[PDB]
Amino acid sequence: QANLMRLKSDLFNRSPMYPGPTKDDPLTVTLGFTLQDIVKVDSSTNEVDLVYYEQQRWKLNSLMWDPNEYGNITDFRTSAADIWTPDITAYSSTRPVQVLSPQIAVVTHDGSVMFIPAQRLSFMCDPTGVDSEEGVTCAVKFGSWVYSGFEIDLKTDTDQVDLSSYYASSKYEILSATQTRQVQHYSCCPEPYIDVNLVVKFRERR
Amino acid sequence: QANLMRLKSDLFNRSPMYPGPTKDDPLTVTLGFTLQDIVKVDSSTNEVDLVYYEQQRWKLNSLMWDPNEYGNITDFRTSAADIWTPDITAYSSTRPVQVLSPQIAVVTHDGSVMFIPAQRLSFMCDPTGVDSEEGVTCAVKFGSWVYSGFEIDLKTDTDQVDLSSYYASSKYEILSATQTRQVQHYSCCPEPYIDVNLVVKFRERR
Amino acid sequence: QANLMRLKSDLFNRSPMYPGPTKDDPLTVTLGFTLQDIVKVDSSTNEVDLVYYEQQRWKLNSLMWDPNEYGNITDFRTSAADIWTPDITAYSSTRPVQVLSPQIAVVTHDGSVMFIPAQRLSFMCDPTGVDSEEGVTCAVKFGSWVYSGFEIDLKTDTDQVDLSSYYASSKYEILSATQTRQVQHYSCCPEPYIDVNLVVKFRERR
Amino acid sequence: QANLMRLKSDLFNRSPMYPGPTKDDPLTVTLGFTLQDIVKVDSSTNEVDLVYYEQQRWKLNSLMWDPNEYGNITDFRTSAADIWTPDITAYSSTRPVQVLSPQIAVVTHDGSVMFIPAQRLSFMCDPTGVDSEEGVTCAVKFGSWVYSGFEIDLKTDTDQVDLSSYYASSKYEILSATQTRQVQHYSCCPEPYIDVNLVVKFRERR
Amino acid sequence: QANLMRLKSDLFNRSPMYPGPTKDDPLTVTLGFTLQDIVKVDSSTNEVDLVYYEQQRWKLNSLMWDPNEYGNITDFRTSAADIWTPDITAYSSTRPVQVLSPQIAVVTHDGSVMFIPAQRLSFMCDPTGVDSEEGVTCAVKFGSWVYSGFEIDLKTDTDQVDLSSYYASSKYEILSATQTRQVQHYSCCPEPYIDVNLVVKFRERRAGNGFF
Numbered sequence A, B, C, D: 001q002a003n004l005m006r007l008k009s010d011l012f013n014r015s016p017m018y019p020g021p022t023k024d025d026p027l028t029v030t031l032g033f034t035l036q037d038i039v040k041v042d043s044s045t046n047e048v049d050l051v052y053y054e055q056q057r058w059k060l061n062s063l064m065w066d067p068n069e070y071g072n073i074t075d076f077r078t079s080a081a082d083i084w085t086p087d088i089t090a091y092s093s094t095r096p097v098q099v100l101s102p103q104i105a106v107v108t109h110d111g112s113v114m115f116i117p118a119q120r121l122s123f124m125c126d127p128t129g130v131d132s133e134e135g136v137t138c139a140v141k142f143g144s145w146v147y148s149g150f151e152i153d154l155k156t157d158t159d160q161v162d163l164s165s166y167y168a169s170s171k172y173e174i175l176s177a178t179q180t181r182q183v184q185h186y187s188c189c190p191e192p193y194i195d196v197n198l199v200v201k202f203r204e205r206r
Numbered sequence E: 001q002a003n004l005m006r007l008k009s010d011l012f013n014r015s016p017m018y019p020g021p022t023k024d025d026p027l028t029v030t031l032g033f034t035l036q037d038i039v040k041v042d043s044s045t046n047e048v049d050l051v052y053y054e055q056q057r058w059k060l061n062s063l064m065w066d067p068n069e070y071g072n073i074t075d076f077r078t079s080a081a082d083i084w085t086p087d088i089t090a091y092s093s094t095r096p097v098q099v100l101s102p103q104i105a106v107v108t109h110d111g112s113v114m115f116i117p118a119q120r121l122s123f124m125c126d127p128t129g130v131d132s133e134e135g136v137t138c139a140v141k142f143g144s145w146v147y148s149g150f151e152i153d154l155k156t157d158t159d160q161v162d163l164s165s166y167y168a169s170s171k172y173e174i175l176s177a178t179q180t181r182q183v184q185h186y187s188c189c190p191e192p193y194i195d196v197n198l199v200v201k202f203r204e205r206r207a208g209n210g211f212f
C-alpha cells in the first residue's frame, strides 16, 4: 500500500494534470470493440441499441516511473478522473451513452494506459429487412469530438470486431462485424479528423 | 505539455473568471446548426425530437495570448467548465436537452472560442400531415435565456442549415431547413432579446 | 469586466451567504406564471404535464450597491448558486420538476432579484371531460415547502396567467388561467403557509 | 441575518460533522406518513406507485443553543446537507425513490430537527382485485438500512396515516392506511432492526 | 460522538486513502445474494430485471483500531465514499444498475467492512418458456471489472442464494438460485479474473400450479 500511495502522490499531486495532446505532442489511441448484444431495434424511429465494451489504449511520458523506486510496482488501477482520457464519441448516437462498468483504468510503468468502458449505445440505423436471410447492415463512427488528426490519431490492432462474448440467445445474430480506421472532414474545420467505423451486419436469429 | 500547462495556468489561475458580457462589454455569438436526424414525432403530444450539433463561436480579449511567449501554441482544447459559455437555450423545449458530445471547447490565440455541443431536443411541433407530400413545418428559437440584445447579440454565417450529415435512412426527409436571426420581446423585460429561429420543413420518407 | 468582478467579489466573497429569511427579517416573493403548453394528459393515472415559466422576484438589502462605486453598473447576471433563492414547490407534483432553462438570475442595484425558471411539471389532475365543450379544470398550489408565512409571504402582480406565448398548435386550448394567493395550514405545523394557486381550465382543441 | 449567520457558523463551522448515532449515543427517529396519491398500479409487474410525504423528527445535543445568545432565534431552516439525516429506506422498492420537495430541514433551539421529504415510490404490490368492492392490501417497511435498534429506534406518534391531503380525484380510494413499528432480524447481522410498516388498503374509486 | 469523531479523523484524515489491492497485498471479497423480486421480463429484447441485495465483505489492516483507545467503539457506520470499495460489476447488464439503498458501510475494529447495496439490474436473459411448468434458467456473472485474480479473489459462504425474503406475490416464482465462484479469461489480458455466477431458475406464478 505504502509504495503505491507514494507512486500515486508523485504522479498526480506534484505537476498540473496533463493538458491533453497538441500538434507538437500528438497521441495515438488504439481502439477495439467487443460486441456483447444487439439488444433492440426500433423500426418506428430507425434507432438500434448495442451493448459492447471499447478497449482504449494510449501512452504518456508523464505517467512513466521506474519500478525500482516504488517497490517493484509495474502497474496500478486508478479512477479515470485522476488521468486524462480521450474523448472518444459515437458520431450518430441518438441518446447519451449509458455507462455499464466502473470508470477505472490500468496504468503501466512505461506510461501506457488501458481503459475499457462498457457502454449501451442507441444510434441511427434502419432495421428494415432484419427478418430476412440477407439481414441489414449498420454503421457508426467512433472518434474524438474535438481533436483533429494532428493531435489524436487512431488505430486498430485488427479490423475484426471481437464476437467471442456475443450473447448466444440474442434476438439477433451477427453475420459480420468490422472496425476500420477512416479519415473525415467537417464543415467547422479544415483539418482531418480520424475515426474508427464500426460496421455490423445482422439478422433475426433463426 | 510544458508550454500549454503554463498558458492554461496564466489564462485561468491568475484572474477571477470572466463574469460574462455587460452593456459596456457586449458579445456577439455566431450560431450554426448541423441537422443529423429527426428521430421521432409524437402526434399525441405534438412533440418532435431532433438530433443536431450547434456550432457556437465568440471572442474574448481575456483569452488572448502571444504564441511567441508559449512555444508557438496557436490553440488548445479545454473543458467548457474552465471558461464562460453562452446560455443558449431552446425556447419551446418540452424536456431537458440531452448532451451527446464531450463538453470541450477549442480556444484560439486571438481569444476566439469554438464550442460544438451535439444535442437531442424534444420541442413543440404538430406533425399532423407529415405523411403527406407537402409535409409539415416546424420552428424552434435558440437564444440566451437571461441576456438581452444589449449584452449578447447573435448572428449566423449563412441562413442555410447544414444538411450534409443528415441521416440518409431517417424516417423523415428534409424539404428545407433555415436558421435566421430574430428580435423578440418578453413580458418580463423592456429590452430586445435575440434568437436564431430554426425552421424545418419535413415529411415521411417515400 | 473589471468593475463587475469587483462588485461580485464585494457582494459574495466578504460575508457569509445570506441564510434565508427569518421571523425578524421576512421576505415577500412575487410570482407570475407564463403558460406555454399543456403537453399531455394521462387519463389512466390522472396526471397532466405543463410547460411554463415562473417569474420570481424578491429584494434583499445585502444585494444593494451604489452604481457610482462600480462603473455605473445597475444590474448583472449571475449563477443562481451564488445567491439564496426561494424554495418554491408545487404541492401536487407526481414527478420531479424538469428544468428547461439556465439557472441564472438578474440582480439589480436596489437589491432586487429576478429569476425565471422554465419547468415541465407533472401534477395531479383528472382530465375526464377534456374532450367536451365545457372542458376540465385543474389546480396546483405553488409555495415554499419549509418557510411559513412569518418568513415568506407571496404575492402576484396580476391574477391573470400570461397566455401570450401559449403554443398555438397544442392539443389543448386554454379557456381560463388564474394565479391567486392563498393561505393554508398543514398537520406538521401551527403556522399559516402561503401559496399561489394556479387554476387552469382547458379542453381539446377544435 | 447577523445573529442567524453567527448561530450557523457556531453550530456547523467549529466541530467536525455529527458522525451519526452509536450504541453509546443512540437516537430515536419519529416517522409519520401523509399519503397524497396512489398514482398508478402496474398489474403486469406487480409494482405500485405512491406519492407521499414522510415527516421525520429527531433530536441532537450538538444542535442545541441558547436563544438569548443569538437574538432570540428559536429555530431556523437549513440545507439537509449541513446536518446528519437518518438513512430511512423502503425495504421493497423496485426503483430509486424520486424526491419531490426541497432538501431543507427546520432546526429548533432544543436540538430537535424536522425534515419532511416528499417522495414518489415504486414498490412490490399485487393489485389483482383492486377493481372489486373489497379492494387490495399492500405493505412496505421503512427503516434504517444500516443502523440496528441499538443506534436508531423508530416510533410513530399515531398508527393512523394522515389522509387529509389525499387527492380527491385519484383513480384509487383509500379504505385504510396504518403505520406501525416492527422489530426484525436479518441474516447478515445479529442485532434487531426497527421499521415502520405502512399498510394501505385501497380500491378503484366508484 | 466525541470518541467516534476522533476515530474517524484518525482513520481517514491522516494517511492518503487506501489505493486498492495489489499483487503484493491482495484482497478476498466475500459475496452473497438475497433475491427479492424478478420484477419483469422483456421477451422482445431478452432482458430480465431483478431486485436483490448483495452482501460484500472484505478486510483491510488500514481500518484496524484498538477499541480501548476509542471509548470501546467496536464498529461504526460511514459513507462508502470515505472508504475504498470493490468494483463488483455484472458482466451481462443492459442498463446501469439502479441503487436502492443508502451508500453506507459498517466498519469493524478488526478492519473488516460490510457493505450491502440493494440493486435493480437489467441483464441478458431469454425468457422463452417461462410460462411453462419447467420454467427457464438464467445466469449473470458478478466480478471486478478491472482487478485480476492476483489482486481480488472472490468467495461465497454458501452456494445457495438467500430466497427467504423473495416477494411472495411476484409474477415469477423461483425454482432454484445458486451463486458459484468461477475463473474466466478475457481477450484484453492474460491473467485470470474471478466472478460469482448467479444462476436462477424461474417460471410464471400460474394457477395454484405444482412443480411437476
Ligand SMILES: *[C@@H]1O[C@H](CO)[C@@H](O)[C@H](O)[C@H]1NC(C)=O
Residues within 6 Å of the ligand: A071, A072
Ligand atoms: C524488488 O526487486 C528487487 C530486485 O530483484 C529485489 O531484490 C527486491 O527484494 C524487491 N523488493 C520488493 C519490495 O519486492
Ligand SMILES: *[C@@H]1O[C@H](CO)[C@@H](O)[C@H](O)[C@H]1NC(C)=O
Residues within 6 Å of the ligand: B071, B072
Ligand atoms: C517557434 O518557431 C520558431 C521558428 O519560426 C522556432 O525557431 C522556435 O523554436 C519555435 N518554438 C518552439 C518552442 O518550438
Ligand SMILES: *[C@@H]1O[C@H](CO)[C@@H](O)[C@H](O)[C@H]1NC(C)=O
Residues within 6 Å of the ligand: C071, C072
Ligand atoms: C459613469 O457616469 C458618469 C456620468 O455620466 C460618467 O461621467 C462616467 O464616465 C461613468 N463611468 C464609467 C466608468 O463609464
Ligand SMILES: *[C@@H]1O[C@H](CO)[C@@H](O)[C@H](O)[C@H]1NC(C)=O
Residues within 6 Å of the ligand: D071, D072
Ligand atoms: C431578545 O429578547 C429580549 C427579551 O425581551 C430583548 O430584551 C432583546 O432586545 C431581544 N433581542 C432581539 C434582537 O430581538
Ligand SMILES: *[C@@H]1O[C@H](CO)[C@@H](O)[C@H](O)[C@H]1NC(C)=O
Residues within 6 Å of the ligand: E071, E072
Ligand atoms: C470501556 O470498557 C471498560 C472495561 O469494561 C469499562 O470499565 C469502561 O467504563 C468502558 N467505557 C468507556 C471507556 O467509555
Ligand SMILES: CN1CCC[C@H]1c1cccnc1
Residues within 6 Å of the ligand: A144, A145, A146, A147, A186, A188, A189, A193, B053, B104, B105, B106, B114, B115, B116
Ligand atoms: C469533428 N467534430 C465533430 C463535429 C464538429 C467537430 C468539432 C471540432 C472542434 C470542437 N468541437 C467539435
Ligand SMILES: CN1CCC[C@H]1c1cccnc1
Residues within 6 Å of the ligand: B144, B145, B146, B147, B186, B188, B189, B193, C053, C104, C105, C106, C114, C115, C116
Ligand atoms: C428572455 N427570457 C425568456 C423568458 C424570460 C426571460 C428572462 C429574462 C431575465 C432572466 N431570466 C429570464
Ligand SMILES: CN1CCC[C@H]1c1cccnc1
Residues within 6 Å of the ligand: C144, C145, C146, C147, C186, C188, C189, C193, D104, D105, D106, D114, D115, D116
Ligand atoms: C409546508 N410543508 C408542506 C407539508 C410539510 C411542510 C414542511 C414544513 C417544514 C419542513 N418541511 C416541510
Ligand SMILES: CN1CCC[C@H]1c1cccnc1
Residues within 6 Å of the ligand: D144, D145, D146, D147, D186, D188, D189, D193, E053, E104, E105, E106, E114, E115, E116
Ligand atoms: C438491515 N439491513 C437490511 C438488509 C441488510 C441490512 C444491512 C446491515 C448493515 C449494512 N447494510 C445493510
Ligand SMILES: CN1CCC[C@H]1c1cccnc1
Residues within 6 Å of the ligand: A053, A104, A105, A106, A114, A115, A116, E144, E145, E146, E147, E186, E188, E189, E193
Ligand atoms: C476483466 N475486464 C472485463 C473485460 C475487460 C477487462 C478489463 C481489464 C482492465 C480494465 N478494464 C476492464
